[PDB]
């Protein structure tokens, strides 16, 4: 449960090597942020190229092919070509893998 | 709902008009980064379930 996540995060802040000692001018920084428009700015071809490394290629073609479909509202039809369809079943995988690609950009490969 | 649909239909046609907003070099960078990470962890790809996976 997410409150356990908060409790373990507080315990991890506490249990570092000399984390509250500021006798020599050390600093602690706590960044919190949100990836703006993470759901709308996923290109589907790049998603397919990054998705063919982990599954069979027909599976990746099926996962990319579902995102390119026409959305309708009662009079209005438009096709989708940029950004993922977030209400799919398997889309819970797509956000969690693509955001993993963000961790290689932020955190670095060595860390 | 109709206003957001008119905005979405406009921005999708703007993406189709202006081309891809990503460059090739950044795509090669993130692709080779993912290749180096998955080869660093020895990840075996997920196979297609052939005839009977028994799950």
């Amino acid at each position: 449960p997410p409150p356990l996540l908060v409790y373990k995060w507080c315990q991890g802040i506490n249990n570092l090597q000399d984390v509250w000692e500021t006798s020599e001018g050390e600093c602690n920084v706590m960044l919190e942020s949100r990836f703006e428009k993470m759901y709308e700015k996923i290109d589907l071809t790049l998603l397919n190229r990054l998705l063919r490394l982990i599954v069979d290629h027909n599976i990746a073609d099926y996962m990319t092919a579902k995102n390119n479909v026409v959305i309708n509202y009662k009079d209005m039809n438009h096709t989708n070509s940029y950004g993922i369809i977030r209400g799919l079943q398997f889309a819970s995988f797509i956000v969690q893998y693509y955001g993993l690609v963000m961790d290689l950009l932020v955190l670095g490969l060595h860390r | 709902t109709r206003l957001y649909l008119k905005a979405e239909q406009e921005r999708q046609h703007n993406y189709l008009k202006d081309g891809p907003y990503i460059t090739a070099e950044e795509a090669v960078a993130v692709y080779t980064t993912t290749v180096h990470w998955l080869e660093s962890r020895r990840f075996s790809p997920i196979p297609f379930p052939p005839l009977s996976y028994k799950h």
Binding site: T45, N68 | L16, G19, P20, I22
Partner: peptide
């Protein structure tokens, strides 16, 4: 296999896609 090449694309958009995604 046999890469996707989205239903959709116009001429120059296909050219740019084949340029930057290959």
């Amino acid at each position: 296999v046999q890469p996707f090449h989205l239903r959709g694309m116009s001429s120059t958009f296909s050219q740019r896609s084949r340029d930057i995604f290959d």
